[PDB]
Amino acid sequence: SMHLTPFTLSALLASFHKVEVLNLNGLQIEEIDTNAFAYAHTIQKLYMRFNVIRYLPPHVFQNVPLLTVLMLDRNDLSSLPPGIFHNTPKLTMMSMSNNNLERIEDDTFQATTALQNLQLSSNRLTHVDLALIPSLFHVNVSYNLLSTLAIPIAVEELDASHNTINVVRGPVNVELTILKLQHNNLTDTAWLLNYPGLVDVDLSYNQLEKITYQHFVKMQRLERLYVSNNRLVALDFTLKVLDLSHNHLMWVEHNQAQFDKLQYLYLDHNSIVTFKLSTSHTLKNLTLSHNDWDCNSLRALFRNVVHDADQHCKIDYHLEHGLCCKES
Amino acid sequence: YKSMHLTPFTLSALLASFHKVEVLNLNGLQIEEIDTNAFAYAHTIQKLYMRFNVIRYLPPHVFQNVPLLTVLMLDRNDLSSLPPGIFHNTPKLTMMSMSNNNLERIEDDTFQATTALQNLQLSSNRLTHVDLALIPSLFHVNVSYNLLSTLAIPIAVEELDASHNTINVVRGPVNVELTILKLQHNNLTDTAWLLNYPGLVDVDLSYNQLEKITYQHFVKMQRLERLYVSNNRLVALDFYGRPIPTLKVLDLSHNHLMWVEHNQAQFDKLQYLYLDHNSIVTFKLSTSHTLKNLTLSHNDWDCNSLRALFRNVAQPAVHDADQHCKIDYHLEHGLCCKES
Numbered sequence A: 001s002m003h004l005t006p007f008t009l010s011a012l013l014a015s016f017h018k019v020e021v022l023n024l025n026g027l028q029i030e031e032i033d034t035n036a037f038a039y040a041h042t043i044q045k046l047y048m049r050f051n052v053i054r055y056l057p058p059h060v061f062q063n064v065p066l067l068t069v070l071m072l073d074r075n076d077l078s079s080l081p082p083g084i085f086h087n088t089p090k091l092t093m094m095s096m097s098n099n100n101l102e103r104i105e106d107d108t109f110q111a112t113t114a115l116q117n118l119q120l121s122s123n124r125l126t127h128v129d130l131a132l133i134p135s136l137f138h139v140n141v142s143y144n145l146l147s148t149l150a151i152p153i154a155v156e157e158l159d160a161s162h163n164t165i166n167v168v169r170g171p172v173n174v175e176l177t178i179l180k181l182q183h184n185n186l187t188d189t190a191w192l193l194n195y196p197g198l199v200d201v202d203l204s205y206n207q208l209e210k211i212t213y214q215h216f217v218k219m220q221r222l223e224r225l226y227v228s229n230n231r232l233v234a235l236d237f238t239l240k241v242l243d244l245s246h247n248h249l250m251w252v253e254h255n256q257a258q259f260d261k262l263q264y265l266y267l268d269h270n271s272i273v274t275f276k277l278s279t280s281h282t283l284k285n286l287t288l289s290h291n292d293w294d295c296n297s298l299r300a301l302f303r304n305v306v307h308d309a310d311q312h313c314k315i316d317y318h319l320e321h322g323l324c325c326k327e328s
Numbered sequence B: 001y002k003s004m005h006l007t008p009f010t011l012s013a014l015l016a017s018f019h020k021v022e023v024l025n026l027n028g029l030q031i032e033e034i035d036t037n038a039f040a041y042a043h044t045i046q047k048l049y050m051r052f053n054v055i056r057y058l059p060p061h062v063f064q065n066v067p068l069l070t071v072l073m074l075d076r077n078d079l080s081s082l083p084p085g086i087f088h089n090t091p092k093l094t095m096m097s098m099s100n101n102n103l104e105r106i107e108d109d110t111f112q113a114t115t116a117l118q119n120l121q122l123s124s125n126r127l128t129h130v131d132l133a134l135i136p137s138l139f140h141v142n143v144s145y146n147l148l149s150t151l152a153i154p155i156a157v158e159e160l161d162a163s164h165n166t167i168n169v170v171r172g173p174v175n176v177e178l179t180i181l182k183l184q185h186n187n188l189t190d191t192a193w194l195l196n197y198p199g200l201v202d203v204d205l206s207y208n209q210l211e212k213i214t215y216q217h218f219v220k221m222q223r224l225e226r227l228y229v230s231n232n233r234l235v236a237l238d239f240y241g242r243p244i245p246t247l248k249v250l251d252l253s254h255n256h257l258m259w260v261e262h263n264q265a266q267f268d269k270l271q272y273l274y275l276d277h278n279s280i281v282t283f284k285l286s287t288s289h290t291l292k293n294l295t296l297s298h299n300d301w302d303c304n305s306l307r308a309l310f311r312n313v314a315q316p317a318v319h320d321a322d323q324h325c326k327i328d329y330h331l332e333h334g335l336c337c338k339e340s
């Protein structure tokens, strides 16, 4: 997000004047000649976003050796020419989000050994081997058709949400910190042992039926864990956020103070009957609705430790602080 | 917006325009706020492109610094209104595009000073008010995909697209220049307003709420070639007058038509006539060789009438067929009909 002022315009204009930054965004470009950039050796940043480009021609980037940033998001690309980045070894950021790409062949980023930010969200990708790009720092491949996620050695933030991923592979990665995998087809979490630096992990809307606590024993930094909308049935356990909402949970045990640093705990839409929570000053937010509470257990929870409520209780159950519960 | 080829020539011409700071491309730069004095040191700008940003407001005097402005493109931003005086100091403006914002209204004084404004693109906003008739310089106008209920047509617009609104009233001065009028997907129930547009060549009234078409409304048409009125609620048509000799396309499909009456030679110059998806039982044509495509399926044909129709029309002109027929109907050259 930029603020347009005489100062920021002047800087933009300076970069244009020298042809170091070329803005071709939003010009309804549909076709590009092979030699369009034949005499544009000065170009370091090339912006071609929000056009209607169907194809990139052979050798299109053969004469732009200083290229570091290339933005081609919001076009109609479905594949890439041979050796597209062969002559752009300085490339640090590349976006082709919102195209129609189907595969990224494995040789694509072989010469781009400084590529650190790669944006490929909202394509039709069935194959991209990110593990072959060990320079990656931030990556987004969300909203594609990937079934296998290969994670490179030192990526720090990776969003692969909204795919059909059921396999995660790649070398141990102590730097991966934010991992977004919501809306996928994951049924196991053993791969979590390879990512000891994780702070935020979202595994919501997957096909998890159990979450075994020994997959988390190498975690040095984990603060936020989202596992809503899976099919978890029971849980028997630096964490600040824990989302267990919308599962099939019959019980959740925690032994015991390891829930004391929690500020956000979501238990709503499960089948929980009892739940213990010590006097944790402070817990910021707690959801309990749409469960099967025993009234005694529910009461004790309000003495020690709400942001939701029940509307209609079923037979045998009555409202108690806005939540349904059954008497002993 | 028309598409371009990026060639050494077109890139050279672009770079030359950029070099002189006569064309400024700020498209796609995630611009959110703009300071009133943003263009204080850029008085040379004639074409200003700020499409595909996230601009929420324009300062009222932001364009005082660009008095040579002829083209302004602000498509795909987040504007909900224009402030008073926004174009007061831009008299040379000829094209203004602001499609795909959230504009609710254009106030009547917005274009007072822009007396050369010819091309106006406001499609895909939420407009409930824009008085285009105040802007007589308009030549090409697009206000499609809005919430307009009244359409004031300016005096000399040549092409106007107001499709996908909720228009039930058309008004404004007699306009003999209007050639292409797109009004499909609206709420029209009458066509008396057609009398004020004698230059019309192509008119699309499909997906409206027309139950009748009064043939007299077309008596002043000098050059009408294509008339689309599909997907209305038409039940009966009687086209009796002098034919429109220029008319070559007539789309009456997907109505509720029981008949289309006409004098013997009415349709002799049509090339394309679409009657499919109605309730037509009998229909007549003369033996004209001009017809290229005729659609007849999904009706309620009397076999004798249908067979009389094939005897007069050339074999290849029928380009549709029924698949299965209801009880007591059978296929005749691929079309269902019932014997008398």
Ligand SMILES: *[C@@H]1O[C@H](CO)[C@@H](O[C@@H]2O[C@H](CO)[C@@H](O)[C@H](O)[C@H]2NC(C)=O)[C@H](O)[C@H]1NC(C)=O
Pocket: A097, A121, A122, A140, A141, A142, A143, A159, A180
């Ligand atoms: C990865 O890319 C996706 C898709 O562009 C991002 O999702 C969009 O995020 C913005 C801002 O949060 C939302 O306004 C959009 O609605 C989202 N788009 C879609 C299609 O859902 C996502 O934010 C990116 N991931 C990261 C970590 O930045």
Ligand SMILES: *[C@@H]1O[C@H](CO)[C@@H](O[C@@H]2O[C@H](CO)[C@@H](O)[C@H](O)[C@H]2NC(C)=O)[C@H](O)[C@H]1NC(C)=O
Pocket: B123, B124, B142, B143, B144, B145, B161, B182
């Ligand atoms: C008026 O503007 C609209 C923009 O909505 C144009 O509609 C687009 O037409 C193109 C084909 O030319 C299609 O690719 C898009 O799907 C249409 N857009 C939408 C939102 O449906 C329309 O063509 C313009 N009218 C004229 C006569 O040019």
Ligand SMILES: [Cl-]
Pocket: A117, A138
């Ligand atoms: Cl980022």
Ligand SMILES: [Cl-]
Pocket: B084, B085, B086, B087, B088, B109, B110, B111, B112, B113
């Ligand atoms: Cl004004």
Ligand code: NA
Pocket: A173, A174, A175, A176, A177, A194, A195, A196, A197, A198
């Ligand atoms: Na890690």
